[PDB]
Short mmCIF file of C-alpha atoms in Angstrom, two decimals:
data_model
loop_
_atom_site.label_atom_id
_atom_site.label_comp_id
_atom_site.label_asym_id
_atom_site.label_seq_id
_atom_site.Cartn_x
_atom_site.Cartn_y
_atom_site.Cartn_z
CA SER A 520 -34.33 70.49 -39.27
CA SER A 521 -31.11 68.64 -40.48
CA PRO A 522 -27.84 70.53 -41.43
CA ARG A 523 -27.88 71.88 -45.03
CA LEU A 524 -25.22 73.01 -47.44
CA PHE A 525 -25.63 76.67 -48.56
CA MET A 526 -23.59 77.45 -51.68
CA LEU A 527 -22.01 80.84 -52.09
CA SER A 528 -19.88 82.07 -54.97
CA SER A 529 -18.32 85.18 -56.42
CA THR A 530 -15.52 86.54 -58.64
CA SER A 531 -12.87 87.23 -55.92
CA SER A 532 -12.14 86.41 -52.22
CA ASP A 533 -13.17 89.97 -51.23
CA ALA A 534 -16.31 89.96 -53.40
CA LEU A 535 -17.25 86.53 -51.92
CA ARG A 536 -17.06 88.13 -48.44
CA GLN A 537 -19.26 91.04 -49.65
CA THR A 538 -21.75 88.42 -51.02
CA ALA A 539 -21.69 86.57 -47.65
CA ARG A 540 -22.34 89.83 -45.78
CA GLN A 541 -25.31 90.88 -47.97
CA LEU A 542 -26.76 87.36 -47.70
CA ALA A 543 -26.38 87.32 -43.86
CA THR A 544 -28.14 90.68 -43.53
CA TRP A 545 -31.00 89.45 -45.84
CA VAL A 546 -31.34 86.07 -44.08
CA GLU A 547 -31.38 87.82 -40.72
CA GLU A 548 -34.26 90.09 -41.79
CA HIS A 549 -36.35 87.39 -43.52
CA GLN A 550 -35.60 84.36 -41.31
CA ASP A 551 -39.20 84.16 -40.15
CA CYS A 552 -40.43 84.01 -43.81
CA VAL A 553 -37.91 81.83 -45.58
CA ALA A 554 -37.67 78.08 -45.19
CA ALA A 555 -34.06 76.90 -44.92
CA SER A 556 -34.72 74.23 -47.55
CA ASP A 557 -35.98 76.79 -50.09
CA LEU A 558 -32.97 79.03 -49.55
CA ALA A 559 -30.46 76.12 -49.89
CA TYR A 560 -32.24 75.00 -53.11
CA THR A 561 -32.23 78.61 -54.49
CA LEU A 562 -28.53 79.10 -53.79
CA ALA A 563 -27.61 75.81 -55.48
CA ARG A 564 -30.07 75.58 -58.35
CA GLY A 565 -31.28 79.18 -58.83
CA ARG A 566 -27.80 80.77 -59.04
CA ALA A 567 -25.14 80.44 -61.69
CA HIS A 568 -22.06 79.25 -59.80
CA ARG A 569 -19.27 81.82 -60.16
CA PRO A 570 -15.48 80.89 -60.12
CA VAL A 571 -14.64 81.64 -56.45
CA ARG A 572 -16.79 79.14 -54.45
CA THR A 573 -17.52 78.27 -50.81
CA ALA A 574 -20.43 76.62 -48.88
CA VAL A 575 -21.66 77.09 -45.34
CA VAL A 576 -23.18 74.21 -43.37
CA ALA A 577 -26.10 75.16 -41.04
CA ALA A 578 -29.22 73.45 -39.50
CA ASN A 579 -31.18 76.70 -39.05
CA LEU A 580 -31.26 80.21 -40.51
CA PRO A 581 -29.68 81.90 -37.39
CA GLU A 582 -26.83 79.34 -37.62
CA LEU A 583 -26.33 80.30 -41.31
CA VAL A 584 -26.14 84.02 -40.37
CA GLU A 585 -23.28 83.17 -37.95
CA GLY A 586 -21.48 81.05 -40.57
CA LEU A 587 -21.95 83.68 -43.31
CA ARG A 588 -20.75 86.52 -41.06
CA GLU A 589 -17.73 84.39 -40.08
CA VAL A 590 -16.85 84.15 -43.83
CA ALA A 591 -17.54 87.91 -44.33
CA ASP A 592 -15.31 88.91 -41.42
CA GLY A 593 -12.44 86.45 -42.16
CA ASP A 594 -9.17 86.83 -44.11
CA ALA A 595 -9.30 83.50 -46.01
CA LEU A 596 -8.04 82.91 -49.51
CA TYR A 597 -10.68 81.15 -51.60
CA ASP A 598 -9.11 79.35 -54.52
CA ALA A 599 -11.03 79.58 -57.82
CA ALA A 600 -12.54 76.57 -59.60
CA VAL A 601 -10.16 74.81 -62.09
CA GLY A 602 -13.04 73.13 -64.00
CA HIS A 603 -15.87 74.98 -65.83
CA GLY A 604 -18.74 72.65 -64.77
CA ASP A 605 -18.64 71.08 -68.27
CA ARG A 606 -16.64 67.87 -67.46
CA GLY A 607 -17.17 65.50 -64.61
CA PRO A 608 -14.35 64.53 -62.29
CA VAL A 609 -11.68 61.98 -63.23
CA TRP A 610 -11.88 59.27 -60.59
CA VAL A 611 -8.37 58.01 -59.68
CA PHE A 612 -8.21 54.45 -58.31
CA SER A 613 -4.82 53.83 -56.63
CA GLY A 614 -3.14 50.42 -55.79
CA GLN A 615 -2.44 48.64 -52.45
CA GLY A 616 -1.24 50.45 -49.32
CA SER A 617 -4.15 52.82 -48.71
CA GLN A 618 -5.82 50.43 -46.20
CA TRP A 619 -6.31 51.35 -42.50
CA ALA A 620 -8.11 49.88 -39.44
CA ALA A 621 -11.93 50.11 -39.60
CA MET A 622 -11.67 52.18 -42.78
CA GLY A 623 -15.25 51.21 -43.71
CA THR A 624 -17.06 51.73 -40.37
CA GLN A 625 -18.21 55.39 -40.66
CA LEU A 626 -19.20 55.12 -44.32
CA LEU A 627 -21.17 51.90 -43.69
CA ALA A 628 -23.14 53.92 -41.12
CA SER A 629 -23.44 57.31 -42.87
CA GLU A 630 -23.82 56.18 -46.50
CA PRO A 631 -26.57 53.73 -47.41
CA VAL A 632 -25.27 53.34 -50.99
CA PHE A 633 -21.78 52.49 -49.58
CA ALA A 634 -23.43 49.86 -47.33
CA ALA A 635 -25.54 48.46 -50.24
CA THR A 636 -22.45 48.13 -52.50
CA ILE A 637 -20.39 46.41 -49.78
CA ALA A 638 -23.43 44.09 -49.18
CA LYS A 639 -23.42 43.03 -52.89
CA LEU A 640 -19.67 42.29 -52.75
CA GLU A 641 -19.85 40.42 -49.44
CA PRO A 642 -20.99 36.94 -50.80
CA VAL A 643 -18.76 37.25 -53.90
CA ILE A 644 -15.57 37.90 -51.93
CA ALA A 645 -16.69 35.25 -49.38
CA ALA A 646 -17.00 32.61 -52.19
CA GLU A 647 -13.80 33.71 -53.99
CA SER A 648 -11.34 34.54 -51.13
CA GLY A 649 -13.00 32.90 -48.11
CA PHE A 650 -13.46 35.92 -45.87
CA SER A 651 -15.92 38.61 -44.83
CA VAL A 652 -15.05 41.90 -46.53
CA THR A 653 -17.44 43.68 -44.04
CA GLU A 654 -15.63 42.14 -41.06
CA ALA A 655 -12.25 43.06 -42.67
CA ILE A 656 -13.13 46.77 -43.29
CA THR A 657 -14.64 47.24 -39.78
CA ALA A 658 -12.06 45.19 -37.70
CA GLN A 659 -10.01 47.02 -35.05
CA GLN A 660 -6.75 45.79 -36.88
CA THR A 661 -5.90 46.88 -40.47
CA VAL A 662 -6.49 44.22 -43.23
CA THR A 663 -3.20 42.35 -43.78
CA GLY A 664 -2.52 39.49 -46.39
CA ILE A 665 -2.36 40.31 -50.19
CA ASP A 666 -5.40 37.99 -50.71
CA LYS A 667 -7.42 40.11 -48.19
CA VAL A 668 -5.95 43.58 -48.82
CA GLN A 669 -6.73 43.73 -52.57
CA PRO A 670 -10.47 42.69 -52.25
CA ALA A 671 -10.97 45.02 -49.23
CA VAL A 672 -9.35 48.08 -50.93
CA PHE A 673 -11.25 47.33 -54.19
CA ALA A 674 -14.55 47.08 -52.22
CA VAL A 675 -13.94 50.53 -50.62
CA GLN A 676 -13.03 52.01 -54.03
CA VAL A 677 -16.20 50.82 -55.81
CA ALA A 678 -18.47 51.64 -52.85
CA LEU A 679 -17.07 55.24 -52.80
CA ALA A 680 -17.81 55.63 -56.56
CA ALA A 681 -21.35 54.22 -56.21
CA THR A 682 -22.10 56.62 -53.35
CA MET A 683 -20.79 59.61 -55.32
CA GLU A 684 -22.92 58.74 -58.31
CA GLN A 685 -26.16 57.46 -56.77
CA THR A 686 -26.32 59.63 -53.64
CA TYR A 687 -24.53 62.84 -54.79
CA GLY A 688 -25.26 62.93 -58.57
CA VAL A 689 -21.57 62.90 -59.49
CA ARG A 690 -21.14 60.96 -62.78
CA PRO A 691 -17.38 60.65 -63.60
CA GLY A 692 -16.04 62.39 -66.67
CA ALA A 693 -13.29 59.70 -66.98
CA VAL A 694 -11.54 56.97 -64.87
CA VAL A 695 -7.81 56.27 -64.33
CA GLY A 696 -6.52 53.18 -62.44
CA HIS A 697 -3.07 52.33 -61.03
CA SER A 698 -2.31 48.54 -61.01
CA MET A 699 -5.08 46.88 -58.74
CA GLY A 700 -6.94 50.21 -58.97
CA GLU A 701 -7.76 49.22 -62.56
CA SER A 702 -10.33 46.58 -61.39
CA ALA A 703 -12.39 49.33 -59.68
CA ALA A 704 -11.82 51.60 -62.71
CA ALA A 705 -13.18 48.80 -65.00
CA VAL A 706 -16.41 48.47 -62.87
CA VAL A 707 -16.96 52.28 -62.78
CA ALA A 708 -16.28 52.60 -66.54
CA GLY A 709 -18.66 49.74 -67.41
CA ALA A 710 -15.88 47.53 -68.86
CA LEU A 711 -16.64 44.77 -66.26
CA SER A 712 -19.57 43.90 -64.01
CA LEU A 713 -19.08 44.46 -60.23
CA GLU A 714 -18.97 40.64 -59.81
CA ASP A 715 -16.43 39.97 -62.60
CA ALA A 716 -14.20 42.77 -61.33
CA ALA A 717 -14.43 41.28 -57.81
CA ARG A 718 -13.47 37.87 -59.35
CA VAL A 719 -10.48 39.61 -61.07
CA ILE A 720 -9.08 41.10 -57.82
CA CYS A 721 -9.90 38.00 -55.71
CA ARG A 722 -8.23 35.57 -58.12
CA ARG A 723 -5.27 37.96 -58.90
CA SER A 724 -4.48 38.24 -55.11
CA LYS A 725 -4.89 34.53 -54.41
CA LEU A 726 -2.35 33.67 -57.14
CA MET A 727 0.06 36.37 -55.86
CA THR A 728 0.32 34.60 -52.50
CA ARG A 729 2.17 31.76 -54.39
CA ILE A 730 5.07 34.12 -55.21
CA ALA A 731 5.28 36.01 -51.89
CA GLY A 732 8.90 36.74 -50.98
CA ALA A 733 10.06 36.82 -54.71
CA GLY A 734 11.84 40.21 -55.10
CA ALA A 735 11.62 43.77 -53.68
CA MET A 736 10.59 47.27 -54.93
CA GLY A 737 11.79 50.85 -54.53
CA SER A 738 10.67 54.40 -55.31
CA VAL A 739 13.10 56.99 -56.70
CA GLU A 740 12.53 60.68 -57.48
CA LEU A 741 14.13 60.39 -60.92
CA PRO A 742 12.41 60.24 -64.33
CA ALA A 743 12.03 56.74 -65.82
CA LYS A 744 14.30 57.38 -68.85
CA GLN A 745 17.10 58.31 -66.43
CA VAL A 746 16.45 55.24 -64.22
CA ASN A 747 16.53 52.93 -67.24
CA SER A 748 19.80 54.49 -68.40
CA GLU A 749 21.40 53.76 -65.01
CA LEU A 750 20.24 50.08 -65.09
CA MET A 751 21.63 49.50 -68.58
CA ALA A 752 24.85 51.39 -67.81
CA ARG A 753 25.38 49.33 -64.65
CA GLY A 754 24.74 45.98 -66.48
CA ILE A 755 21.60 45.27 -64.41
CA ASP A 756 19.12 42.78 -66.02
CA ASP A 757 17.29 41.57 -62.84
CA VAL A 758 15.75 44.95 -61.86
CA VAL A 759 13.37 46.94 -64.22
CA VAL A 760 11.04 50.06 -64.16
CA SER A 761 7.80 48.72 -62.68
CA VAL A 762 5.85 51.96 -62.25
CA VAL A 763 6.02 55.35 -63.98
CA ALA A 764 3.88 57.51 -61.66
CA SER A 765 4.99 61.03 -62.60
CA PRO A 766 7.44 62.74 -65.01
CA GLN A 767 9.81 62.98 -61.99
CA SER A 768 8.89 59.74 -60.11
CA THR A 769 9.71 56.04 -60.85
CA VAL A 770 9.28 52.68 -59.04
CA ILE A 771 11.84 49.90 -59.76
CA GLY A 772 11.25 46.19 -59.14
CA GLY A 773 13.34 43.07 -59.26
CA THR A 774 15.67 40.93 -57.12
CA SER A 775 15.79 41.91 -53.42
CA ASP A 776 19.60 42.47 -53.28
CA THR A 777 20.04 44.64 -56.45
CA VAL A 778 17.03 46.79 -55.51
CA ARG A 779 18.62 47.38 -52.03
CA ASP A 780 22.01 48.13 -53.63
CA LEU A 781 20.40 50.68 -56.07
CA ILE A 782 18.50 52.48 -53.31
CA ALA A 783 21.71 52.68 -51.23
CA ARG A 784 23.53 54.36 -54.17
CA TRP A 785 20.70 56.83 -54.98
CA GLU A 786 20.42 57.93 -51.33
CA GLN A 787 24.22 58.57 -51.25
CA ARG A 788 23.78 60.95 -54.27
CA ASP A 789 21.10 62.84 -52.22
CA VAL A 790 18.24 61.57 -54.39
CA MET A 791 14.88 60.77 -52.82
CA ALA A 792 15.15 56.87 -52.89
CA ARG A 793 13.33 54.34 -50.53
CA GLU A 794 12.29 50.69 -50.36
CA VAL A 795 8.57 50.02 -50.91
CA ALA A 796 6.73 47.51 -48.64
CA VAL A 797 6.32 44.43 -50.86
CA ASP A 798 6.53 40.58 -50.74
CA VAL A 799 6.66 40.33 -54.58
CA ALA A 800 8.14 42.65 -57.23
CA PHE A 801 5.04 43.29 -59.41
CA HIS A 802 5.28 44.61 -63.01
CA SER A 803 8.66 42.79 -63.31
CA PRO A 804 9.63 39.23 -64.45
CA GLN A 805 9.00 38.08 -60.81
CA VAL A 806 5.29 37.70 -61.66
CA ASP A 807 5.99 35.53 -64.78
CA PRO A 808 5.28 32.11 -63.08
CA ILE A 809 1.70 32.98 -62.12
CA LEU A 810 0.65 34.56 -65.49
CA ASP A 811 -0.44 31.30 -67.23
CA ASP A 812 -2.61 30.40 -64.17
CA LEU A 813 -4.14 33.89 -64.03
CA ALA A 814 -5.10 33.74 -67.73
CA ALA A 815 -6.85 30.40 -67.02
CA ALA A 816 -8.68 31.74 -63.92
CA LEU A 817 -9.95 34.79 -65.87
CA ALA A 818 -10.95 32.92 -69.05
CA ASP A 819 -14.68 33.35 -68.12
CA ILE A 820 -14.57 37.11 -67.30
CA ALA A 821 -17.02 38.92 -69.66
CA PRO A 822 -15.56 42.25 -70.84
CA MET A 823 -17.72 45.09 -72.18
CA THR A 824 -17.12 48.30 -74.14
CA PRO A 825 -16.40 51.12 -71.64
CA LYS A 826 -19.23 53.62 -71.22
CA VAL A 827 -16.85 56.31 -69.74
CA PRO A 828 -13.37 57.44 -71.01
CA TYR A 829 -10.84 54.96 -69.51
CA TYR A 830 -7.23 56.09 -69.39
CA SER A 831 -5.31 52.82 -69.39
CA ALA A 832 -2.00 52.50 -67.50
CA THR A 833 -1.65 48.92 -69.04
CA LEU A 834 -2.09 49.73 -72.80
CA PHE A 835 0.68 51.53 -74.73
CA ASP A 836 -1.87 54.24 -75.77
CA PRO A 837 -3.78 55.38 -72.67
CA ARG A 838 -6.43 56.96 -74.90
CA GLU A 839 -7.18 53.48 -76.37
CA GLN A 840 -10.23 51.80 -74.78
CA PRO A 841 -9.55 48.49 -73.05
CA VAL A 842 -10.89 45.03 -73.82
CA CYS A 843 -10.83 43.87 -70.17
CA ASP A 844 -10.44 40.14 -70.93
CA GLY A 845 -8.05 37.81 -68.99
CA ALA A 846 -5.15 38.81 -71.31
CA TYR A 847 -5.71 42.46 -70.23
CA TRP A 848 -5.42 41.52 -66.54
CA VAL A 849 -2.27 39.44 -67.18
CA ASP A 850 -0.72 42.50 -68.98
CA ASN A 851 -1.93 44.70 -66.09
CA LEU A 852 0.08 42.60 -63.62
CA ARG A 853 3.21 42.21 -65.81
CA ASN A 854 3.56 45.47 -67.83
CA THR A 855 4.87 48.72 -66.33
CA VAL A 856 2.15 50.89 -64.69
CA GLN A 857 2.21 53.87 -67.12
CA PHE A 858 0.23 56.03 -64.70
CA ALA A 859 1.90 59.34 -65.61
CA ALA A 860 1.11 58.88 -69.29
CA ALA A 861 -2.56 58.07 -68.47
CA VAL A 862 -2.96 61.18 -66.27
CA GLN A 863 -1.13 63.30 -68.87
CA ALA A 864 -3.52 62.06 -71.59
CA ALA A 865 -6.58 62.98 -69.46
CA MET A 866 -5.14 66.43 -68.79
CA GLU A 867 -4.29 66.97 -72.48
CA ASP A 868 -7.93 66.00 -73.27
CA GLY A 869 -9.18 68.78 -70.97
CA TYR A 870 -9.81 67.19 -67.57
CA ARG A 871 -8.75 69.37 -64.58
CA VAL A 872 -10.59 67.89 -61.55
CA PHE A 873 -9.22 64.56 -60.23
CA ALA A 874 -10.53 62.84 -57.11
CA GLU A 875 -8.90 59.79 -55.67
CA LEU A 876 -11.53 57.29 -54.54
CA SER A 877 -9.40 55.23 -52.10
CA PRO A 878 -9.15 54.69 -48.27
CA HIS A 879 -6.20 57.15 -48.19
CA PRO A 880 -4.51 59.26 -50.95
CA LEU A 881 -1.49 57.52 -52.61
CA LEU A 882 -1.42 59.34 -55.99
CA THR A 883 -2.53 62.91 -55.16
CA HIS A 884 1.07 64.18 -55.42
CA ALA A 885 1.66 62.25 -58.66
CA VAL A 886 -1.41 63.97 -60.30
CA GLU A 887 -0.19 67.38 -59.08
CA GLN A 888 3.32 66.74 -60.45
CA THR A 889 1.91 65.81 -63.93
CA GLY A 890 -0.29 69.00 -63.93
CA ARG A 891 2.70 71.17 -62.93
CA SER A 892 4.73 69.58 -65.76
CA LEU A 893 2.03 70.55 -68.29
CA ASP A 894 1.82 74.11 -66.74
CA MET A 895 -1.86 73.49 -65.92
CA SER A 896 -4.04 74.42 -62.91
CA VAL A 897 -5.56 71.12 -61.71
CA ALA A 898 -7.28 69.88 -58.54
CA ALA A 899 -6.14 66.52 -57.04
CA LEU A 900 -8.66 65.66 -54.33
CA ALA A 901 -8.68 62.77 -51.84
CA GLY A 902 -12.00 60.93 -51.35
CA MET A 903 -10.93 59.66 -47.93
CA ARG A 904 -8.06 60.06 -45.53
CA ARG A 905 -6.80 57.68 -42.79
CA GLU A 906 -8.67 58.33 -39.48
CA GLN A 907 -10.63 61.21 -41.03
CA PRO A 908 -13.97 61.54 -39.29
CA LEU A 909 -16.81 61.28 -41.83
CA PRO A 910 -19.93 62.14 -39.76
CA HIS A 911 -21.65 63.54 -42.88
CA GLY A 912 -20.40 60.78 -45.23
CA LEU A 913 -19.03 61.95 -48.54
CA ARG A 914 -20.85 65.34 -48.41
CA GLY A 915 -17.40 66.93 -47.78
CA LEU A 916 -16.00 65.46 -51.01
CA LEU A 917 -19.12 66.75 -52.87
CA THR A 918 -18.42 70.28 -51.54
CA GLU A 919 -14.74 70.11 -52.65
CA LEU A 920 -15.79 68.78 -56.10
CA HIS A 921 -18.22 71.73 -56.40
CA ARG A 922 -15.62 74.28 -55.16
CA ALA A 923 -13.14 72.87 -57.83
CA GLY A 924 -15.63 73.19 -60.70
CA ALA A 925 -16.44 69.56 -61.47
CA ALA A 926 -19.66 69.01 -63.44
CA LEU A 927 -22.34 67.56 -61.18
CA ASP A 928 -26.16 67.18 -60.96
CA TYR A 929 -27.44 69.69 -58.43
CA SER A 930 -30.96 68.11 -58.55
CA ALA A 931 -29.50 65.04 -56.66
CA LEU A 932 -28.67 66.96 -53.49
CA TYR A 933 -31.35 69.71 -53.86
CA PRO A 934 -34.26 67.76 -55.44
CA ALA A 935 -37.12 70.32 -54.91
CA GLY A 936 -38.03 73.74 -53.39
CA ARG A 937 -39.26 77.24 -54.16
CA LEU A 938 -36.98 79.86 -55.69
CA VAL A 939 -36.65 82.65 -53.07
CA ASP A 940 -36.02 86.36 -53.57
CA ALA A 941 -32.51 86.14 -52.08
CA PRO A 942 -29.93 88.76 -53.19
CA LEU A 943 -28.37 88.59 -56.67
CA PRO A 944 -24.86 90.17 -56.55
CA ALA A 945 -23.81 92.66 -59.31
CA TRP A 946 -21.57 91.36 -62.18
#
């Protein structure tokens, strides 16, 4: 009786419409014989998924005939899958800034695994940071202080990954984190326990409140080698490259005045410069005072060997597998975020489907820019968007992962049924 996802695929946009039309005619003639569950199961598990994919949502067979005929009559361009169903998606865990008011409300209601994960984190974040992460992610005002933002964003990140794996059968092929995103990446990769990773973000953000107001940051659409050249040429020692997000994008960090002066000059040369909303200048010497204290706070963190490929933005070789001890988290906060190099390594290793598990996409464009620079066809998906209605939870993200060609377990969403004599399109 509930709405089901009917997968349809072909070799071209026109052949996919021909497939939709034959299926609609068949479904219309056999609707009294075929159970909708059996047909959805057959289309997902009894058919080899071809490159040009789509899916129609419908609660009953007559509804599916309308949806299928709509596809068949349309003039839509269906992009082909970039992955070959052999590698799982690369989950991208972005930094701060993705947060929005009541970002967790619909997923707490529509996804039981999201709710269960947030429930686990609730007493840990309460003991560590002194606040309710559930109250924070469902409040009518967006979460605000660094000590509250980081645990709340981390909690959404890990709850999204748990839902995708447990509820939708999507095991990640690899993980990539960007600054605070690396704590969620460490949990998902099996490098840290959920609790130790929560302790890492809670303690990290509490210590950062001590240095709030110490420097400023700025984004510039210039490659990092060029930015560094300008700093050295201008005799600037108080501002450094803090983030390397794409081959054409760089974030600088340092003293408030020199950062403002540099952005003023870049803008005047018609370059895409802009100040970034910060209290502290992370991944710069501004964080130096709090590094001894952080090392001490994280001395008890128990790191583990990652179970999934982890593309480190902290290590000098992103392919190297992290030892997520306190020293790693101190380096994570102080070293440049080499995000572009980590994404480039994953793409060189064969990954083409990237999905950003965050409250709102911050690094979708960065992933696309790295793919474009390698002359590769990649998919950079967003797990959630600000104020996006999610009445069917993350089922939308599952559809887009399927459409893109990410490897996933179809027995999670279609656990049982009878194979039906539905049409098999010619080669």
